[PDB]
Scaffold this active site. Structure first.
Site, PDB file in Angstrom:
ATOM      1  N   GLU C 131       0.901  -1.150   0.000  1.00  0.00           N
ATOM      2  CA  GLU C 131       0.000   0.000   0.000  1.00  0.00           C
ATOM      3  C   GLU C 131       0.911   1.163   0.000  1.00  0.00           C
ATOM      4  O   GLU C 131       1.333   1.631   1.043  1.00  0.00           O
ATOM      5  CB  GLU C 131      -0.849  -0.081   1.237  1.00  0.00           C
ATOM      6  CG  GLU C 131      -2.013   0.892   1.362  1.00  0.00           C
ATOM      7  CD  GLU C 131      -2.866   0.463   2.537  1.00  0.00           C
ATOM      8  OE1 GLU C 131      -2.324  -0.236   3.449  1.00  0.00           O
ATOM      9  OE2 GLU C 131      -4.035   0.790   2.528  1.00  0.00           O
ATOM     10  N   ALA C 219     -10.921   5.888   3.894  1.00  0.00           N
ATOM     11  CA  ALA C 219      -9.867   6.581   3.083  1.00  0.00           C
ATOM     12  C   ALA C 219     -10.285   6.628   1.585  1.00  0.00           C
ATOM     13  O   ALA C 219      -9.518   6.331   0.663  1.00  0.00           O
ATOM     14  CB  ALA C 219      -8.492   5.936   3.269  1.00  0.00           C
ATOM     15  N   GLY C 248     -17.591  -2.736  13.511  1.00  0.00           N
ATOM     16  CA  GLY C 248     -18.598  -1.863  14.079  1.00  0.00           C
ATOM     17  C   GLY C 248     -18.105  -0.467  14.335  1.00  0.00           C
ATOM     18  O   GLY C 248     -18.835   0.300  14.943  1.00  0.00           O
ATOM     19  N   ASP C 272      -7.934  -5.467   8.457  1.00  0.00           N
ATOM     20  CA  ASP C 272      -7.021  -4.378   8.444  1.00  0.00           C
ATOM     21  C   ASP C 272      -6.375  -4.227   9.851  1.00  0.00           C
ATOM     22  O   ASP C 272      -6.023  -3.153  10.235  1.00  0.00           O
ATOM     23  CB  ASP C 272      -7.731  -3.079   8.045  1.00  0.00           C
ATOM     24  CG  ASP C 272      -6.770  -1.951   7.697  1.00  0.00           C
ATOM     25  OD1 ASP C 272      -5.653  -2.206   7.243  1.00  0.00           O
ATOM     26  OD2 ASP C 272      -7.083  -0.774   7.842  1.00  0.00           O
ATOM     27  N   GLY C 307      -6.799   2.718  13.832  1.00  0.00           N
ATOM     28  CA  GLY C 307      -6.343   1.361  13.554  1.00  0.00           C
ATOM     29  C   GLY C 307      -7.487   0.375  13.795  1.00  0.00           C
ATOM     30  O   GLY C 307      -8.457   0.751  14.419  1.00  0.00           O
TER      31      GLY C 307
END
EC number: 3.5.1.25
Lengths: 381, 334, 381, 334
Positions: C131, C219, C248, C272, C307
């Site tokens: 990424e 993003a 959630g 992620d 995060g």
């Protein structure tokens, strides 16, 4: 190189206004705004027509007054050329010649003729569709999961010739799982059809490698509440592709609507047509029966529906007018979806850079105005 | 009182750390347990799932009786015994089936229904008449008595369109069943006012390529509600899956209980989740909100919300009933 | 060889009662009724657990107290081994280590370490997810369709190392179409992410070869009525796969429901996740910021969500409990769908003959009871 | 008379070689041209498509007038001029928007609506009040006058739940719009009785990952109808496609006509077919059956069927209006 402009362009993923398809060396070079065209390239007007990938018919017995069936003289390279030229006139640039037979010598002739044709005619008739010999023929020992000696030698011949055999239609309840798996692993699309399979037998077929079903609802059990049969099984198995005959005669349009909703992007338009399609035939011979074309309808001597005369463009028109399926989705049923089903989508099924330049254009009334094969205009109307 | 300490399914969502406050036979509120009045009595769900009470719109008999078979069975007692049996399997509301071709017996079912309705609100909801037009004075009589006749099943190919239309405008749900109707005949019945179909696939034609029949028609007609028997026996689960995809929010779980069905609503719920790939939220809607809308009682039943009738059931994650509640009273405790 | 029996078996296509999964030489040999098992094979009870293909997480930065990011010491074979072992405990047998960076030396270290790891550890961490560096970083010259010299040399390095690079996430509006096309033609999955792309720029990206999008809605621009942006574009383009973070916290569950309905079989569960997942971390460093794990939540010093700590099994549980998605379909989101998205479905993503024996089992309460990698039990609980 | 020689769309299917027989302002039958009475007058469609007349549930002004802007505009004349302008673009029925916060002006709109309704059946159907709760005596007044107030748009975050509930039980369609509502606020408005939303995406929050807002809520709530402006300008076509997939049979074409919209219903129909990949049959339903059901007039309008009001429009395959018919009279001939 040249560009097609001044009509609605359907790429397979969207309709485009004020755009262009650039064609060079038999390929689509780009799809772009008109304004992103090279200075003084030749523009060839679409004249308000809709431009599409050429239609792809994965089940076709005959058309243009000929059939790829029944006799040694008919199972020929000339028959395939004739059928290609007739298909073009109804927007179909690609097909699978469909040979329905149990005869070993005809089947070997069909394989040899398909190979000869393919060396001379790229991106046209793609490969053979064999429908035979493991069919449950209208009617209904083993543990059918044991391989008999003749069936082993046959499956070996088909696998050795996978380079010209695109699809084999068979009845899952009539063949061992090992045979379905060997065909699939050689690259051949294995299709369930002409079958009395229960739901359970159908699913065992899928697990062994069947990824297609031949003309949904036709030559399959009816659907009952307790026994969904092969057709119910197809409708419930999301990864199985299937053809459907959209003539209004073989399948009631409500059953086509139900199928489209359950199958999503897996439902493919097919003609399953015979000699009268695109011709002026009054009677002919098919799998050993006399069939009359009287009209609309292919009927046997008893008046039973016994063939299709559908063309791909008529099929597209019927799906839009009588099935409430939007034109973009119908075009996908005739192009992208069958291309994926038979693994030719890297070369065909959309209008995009690098793809083969096989296209057709039609008026909003479903009249063919252009057909292009390998970048050459072969039908102008 | 308040029901707390479980997963509350309102019909539209599942809620955690919420409560259902119940008062005077009604749901007063569904709120966060923090917003609960001080000293209100709390009754723990003990990690059970709480649902609107199940509504079975196709039921012949249960608890060892039928509203049917002999003559004395058509009575308030019968409806009371069936209610009590239904509650044990989470089902708070049902329509009893009266199968007859006797005008006099229908007249009897109507007055019995009326008397039951005065004695027992929000329980057996009205009559399901199945007969006699299965495959004149009668029509107007039914029309007159629409306020206690919820559902009439007939075969559309056996009746003039005007009979169907007259029933539907009087307020009765007209349902196609026990029929050999073609697609064309089915579609003519729908245009006339049929809005429901009785146990999809069963007692209807098979579906063929050329002749979809009634079952195929129902699948292709978005606005037609229908019941389906989810015992794994009357309908193969694959056909249920296919029907759920085509019917959407119009498919209702029914038992057709009495070669006969012995299905209960809680069993059907488990079978739909475990064998048909339908989410639990959506299965609960098939047993509550959807039938409620089909028969026009959605204003008082089918969800857990302010002002609706307090008819509820609770069950463990293994589909064992722990509570059933009717007009706010706990009638089953397990 | 051995067989797993006495629990509900999910193949990827159905749930099975009273059936068995036979495992030999690291592979699934068959899936069959119990009664179709070989005489005296060893049966190993599932004890009423649900048996699944092992979960596959195609976007993962870190877990088990470590991250494959930020420093030369962390971008190591040991980090990948640690992350594999932590993933197993939450049913995840396969992942793409996700290195987010613009640094040329770290990126070359990551490629070298991925190759070393892969020689020693088959069917586990599958390949790198890079990424970087073509990201539109929170913020927003060229005709960005012109290739700059450093971007050419970089795309050449990535294409030469396609054998260990599974996916590259990039912002389509920041890169030339030629770069997207070169990466895709080398076999690398190109994913749209960390982008301010309009709908128009997103679609140009898709046409050039993007087939994935990285963590839908996060993003990416918000969706407005007149400007659908990259997210709206993903939702409208049926052939684009995409990951979604089902904690959630990153995506409201109503937006996950809407996404699932629009994306069908293209929506993949991802974590992620970062270091705290499956560990007891209170603070750590990620892409140069301090992040606190306090709890539920990965937050920066300003209290901003920064995060994920999701595990795959927690993700599965959240989708079923809070998104109204049936368990079979959720399991597909965690197995079959990501396998297809990255082209590993011939080996993984279902329980069927010939596939890799990577499986997990869990109670109806979503507690992991077994994880199997290459046929070996690595987690017993 | 009979309409023949074209494609007749009933709302449920397209019919070839059929006829629509019209008598006394009503559709008497839809039948095969063979079943036509001898010597009945036939009026050829000339290959045009025949549809129920379009119903626009969100309209501010057209034909050079608004029911709005100054003061004298709130009149029977205004509603008559808008009707006549709408007919030219196939639209037979609409709800005029009254945007005001003046009680007195609302009282005026109500009596004007009432007077119009006596003079002009099956045309402008009732009032759409937009205001004043956009982002007490009033509520009861509206409730009292529910029989001429079809639709009230409000912002749910600006009103107590009881206001919404009172409107909805009186019979008014309560619609969320001109709102900054979060998802949670939207969902509270729905539970209170909101069943509609006014022009999806426009004058609502954007949708973000964490905050779906009203638009995201509407998409996720199956039972909420909503309008959408299909000019290609107010809403990008991709967002329309996404909304059609999520809303199903709840998405309605509206013009929001008077930086302003100049869309007509026939233009919207063409744009939906040509740019949104929605089949013509389904687009026609978005302009007829769906809005009709949303506002509760489906018993008399929204399909071509026996006994319904004879409000129809016909158009060429290029979407040019050839006929409009209102209570059986041809008011446009092109």
């Amino acid at each position: 190189m040249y560009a097609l402009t001044q009509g609605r362009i359907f790429t397979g993923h969207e309709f485009l206004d004020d755009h262009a398809v650039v064609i060079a060396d038999g390929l689509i070079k780009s799809v772009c705004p008109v304004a992103e065209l090279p200075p003084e390239i030749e523009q060839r007007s679409l004249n308000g027509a809709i431009l599409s990938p050429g239609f792809i018919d994965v089940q076709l017995n005959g058309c243009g007054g000929v059939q790829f069936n029944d006799t040694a003289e008919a199972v020929s390279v000339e028959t395939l050329e004739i059928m290609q030229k007739a298909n073009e006139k109804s927007g179909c640039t690609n097909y699978l010649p469909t040979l329905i037979t149990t005869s070993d010598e005809l089947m070997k002739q069909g394989v040899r003729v398909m190979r000869e044709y393919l060396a001379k005619h790229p991106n046209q008739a793609l490969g053979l569709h064999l429908e035979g010999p493991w069919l449950n023929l209208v009617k209904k020992t083993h543990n059918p999961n044991f391989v008999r000696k003749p069936d082993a030698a046959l499956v070996d011949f088909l696998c050795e010739n996978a380079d010209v055999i695109t699809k084999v239609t068979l009845a899952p309840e009539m063949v061992p799982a090992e045979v379905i798996s060997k065909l699939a692993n050689a690259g051949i699309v294995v299709s369930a059809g002409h079958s009395n399979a229960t739901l359970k037998e159908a699913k065992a077929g899928f697990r062994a490698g069947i990824t297609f079903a031949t003309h949904l609802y036709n030559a399959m059990p009816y659907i009952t509440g307790r026994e969904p049969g092969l057709a119910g099984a197809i409708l419930d198995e999301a990864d199985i592709y299937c053809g459907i005959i959209a003539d209004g005669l073989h399948v009631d349009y409500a059953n086509i609507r139900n199928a489209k909703r359950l199958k999503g992007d897996k439902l493919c338009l097919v003609t399953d047509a015979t000699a009268p399609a695109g011709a002026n035939i009054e009677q002919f011979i098919f799998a050993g029966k006399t069939i009359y074309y009287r009209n609309g309808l292919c009927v046997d001597e008893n008046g039973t529906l016994s063939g299709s005369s559908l063309t791909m463009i008529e099929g597209v028109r019927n799906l839009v007018e009588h099935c409430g399926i939007a034109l973009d989705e119908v075009l996908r049923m005739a192009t992208l979806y069958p291309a994926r089903a038979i693994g030719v989508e890297k070369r065909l099924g959309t209008l995009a850079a690098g793809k083969v330049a096989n296209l057709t254009a039609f008026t909003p009334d479903f009249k063919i105005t252009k057909t292009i094969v390998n970048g050459n205009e072969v039908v102008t109307q």
